[PDB]
Symmetry: C2
Subunit: 354 residues, 2 copies
């Protein structure tokens, strides 16, 4: 189908971003949430900073102490027989390889803006930086849903208490109002639907489950975009397919005449991430109508295959201009890319494959 990868890709890399912590290096500027504001495209970049150690035998985990309001560093020996360092994103206990003790970087959100959709300038300062006890290991992967004049910026809040999803609302990206953890841990990939639907707001989410249950997309309703309920299972993993390991919401649901168009990410058990699509009923989005059998975007460019965590495309937002989607995505957990696609052609793939 028509995938127009921008000539300027990758649009924003770690080389474009200077670290804010002394003794740290920027390892990624990625997974940007996407908004239009005052005539410009905004990307709410996840900027990941890693504390550097001169000794190759030792690695460091950055923890924001919320009580003290400063950054603390926990050191580890790579040869510590109690820990596993094989996933570069995390420092895992050998007895709990399904989770993590610490992360290897600390993230926050920084805005970049563009007049043309292709060339971006960073705001001078960070936008959201860990500010409470739910964010000590970082603020990640901000999504943005605009309803009227209000932008709903929701993001993973990672701490020793779990991975929760929290919400900040704003009309101007300057005055921010904190709305709490809208989803309890363990959850992430929360996408708020862009309008009230038959008297209820909705959001996609993605419980991560210890005991039983796969990494599946769920949906919840809400009277006010603060509290959520009537949780339902929506889109499950598919063994042997591109989304055999996990699925999660990607972009904000796109209203079409055929249903809500869901551009979601899927990964295999080997953590190769692609984008796929699904279509939900317009009036009751708890109903799934169609789903792709093959991806709409895969990691094929060199900036998508090679990086901090390779073989990843991870779209966290897009701007609709008629039939065109200007889709922005993380690549390799390293950088930001852009592409244009067509709604009509995604819809056509859905009809063909379902």
């Amino acid at each position: 189908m028509n995938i127009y990868r921008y000539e300027e890709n990758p649009l924003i890399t770690p080389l474009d971003v200077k670290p804010i912590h002394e003794g740290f290096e920027v390892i990624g500027a990625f997974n940007g949430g996407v908004a239009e504001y005052n005539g410009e495209v905004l990307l709410l970049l996840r900027v990941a900073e890693k504390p550097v150690s001169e000794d190759p035998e030792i690695v460091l985990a950055p923890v924001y102490n919320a009580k003290n309001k400063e950054l603390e560093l926990q050191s580890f020996r790579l040869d510590d027989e109690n820990y596993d360092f094989e996933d570069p994103r995390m420092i895992r206990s050998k007895a709990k390889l399904e989770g993590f003790s610490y992360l290897t970087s600390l993230s926050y959100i920084r805005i970049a803006r563009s007049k043309d959709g292709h060339h971006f300038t960073l705001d001078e300062k960070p936008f959201l930086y860990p500010f409470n006890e739910y964010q000590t290991f970082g603020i990640e992967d901000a999504r943005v849903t605009q309803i009227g004049d209000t932008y709903h910026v929701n993001f993973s809040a990672v701490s020793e208490f779990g991975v929760a999803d929290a919400l900040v609302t704003t009309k101007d990206f300057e005055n921010l109002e904190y709305q709490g953890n809208i989803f309890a841990p363990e959850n992430k990939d929360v996408l708020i639907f862009p309008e009230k639907i038959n008297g209820k707001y909705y959001a996609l989410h993605r419980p991560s489950l210890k005991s039983i249950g796969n990494l599946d997309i769920w949906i919840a309703s809400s009277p006010d975009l603060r509290s959520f309920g009537d949780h339902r299972h929506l889109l499950g993993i598919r063994p042997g397919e591109y989304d055999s390991g996990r699925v999660g919401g990607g972009c904000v649901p796109i209203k079409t005449e055929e249903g809500w168009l869901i551009l979601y990410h899927g990964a295999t058990e080997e953590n190769r991430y692609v984008m796929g699509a699904a279509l939900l009923d317009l009036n009751d989005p708890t109903i799934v109508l169609k789903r792709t059998k093959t991806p709409i975007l895969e990691p094929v460019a060199d900036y998508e295959k090679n990086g901090f965590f390779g073989d990843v495309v991870f779209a966290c937002g897009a701007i609709q201009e008629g039939d065109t989607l200007h889709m922005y995505y993380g690549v390799a957990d390293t950088s930001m890319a852009g592409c244009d696609m067509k709604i009509s052609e995604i819809l056509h793939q859905l009809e063909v494959e379902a």
Copy 2:
């Protein structure tokens, strides 16, 4: 504490309950939620039933099929090297001992009623039995919060999609309105506060967490007791204490002058379960004022000891009569017991140990 354990304990045991599934045995009638209705104490018992296999090399998972509305038992060999059968409650993948693929029992809720608080009679039939795709492995551990004339009966909904917490409301225990999964998986030990508090309803909860986080009590607010938000961490585990392994909500929060009194359960890593207490700010129950350092109720009577993994008391509700709390609790994973204690003594222990 000066606990008065009921002379008739254990009040209700598996021997008192006949199985509703052909071929099964009742293995527990326990963890009962507690309500007062029409001049009687109601216990919303969790009844757990296990199938009996003709072949002792085979164990059966009693799974409810939500399309056909009946059980479809699934067979597993004890000698199957993909599975671990060492926790008799579960069939576990050897690669995922922190979870389960199946349960070896299936639970539902059945009411028992008493005029005197001590002698109970079962309702003829079940009250809540798996009825959707979120309940295929059972309905467990129902709690009851009465607000005015409405009873909020919330419970664990176990399936292949996860362990969620779901809500049914009723004014008479006969006409029930299903309100959906109020908390997403993975959650349980949900206790709805019995009043609107400064413009919001509140519920304790207890996220179970795969990646990072202990088994800690959280709290959430709600405008309507259907949707919940502003999730906050409330009570965490404590290394070296009776609640070093996990905590969870027990009874419905009790309004006192001093704050909300939370009678919660705690367990060590060695799986001994006790009751403790905490006191929350009356106007903002997200604030914790005091917490016990020793238990309020511990397993010491013979019927409280010898659960499969340890001694267990597990209180899922109580009825207040003045200063007296008539507390009902699961014992040893199998049966129900009752005790009386004084609220003033619990507040007094909170004071003394918080100092």
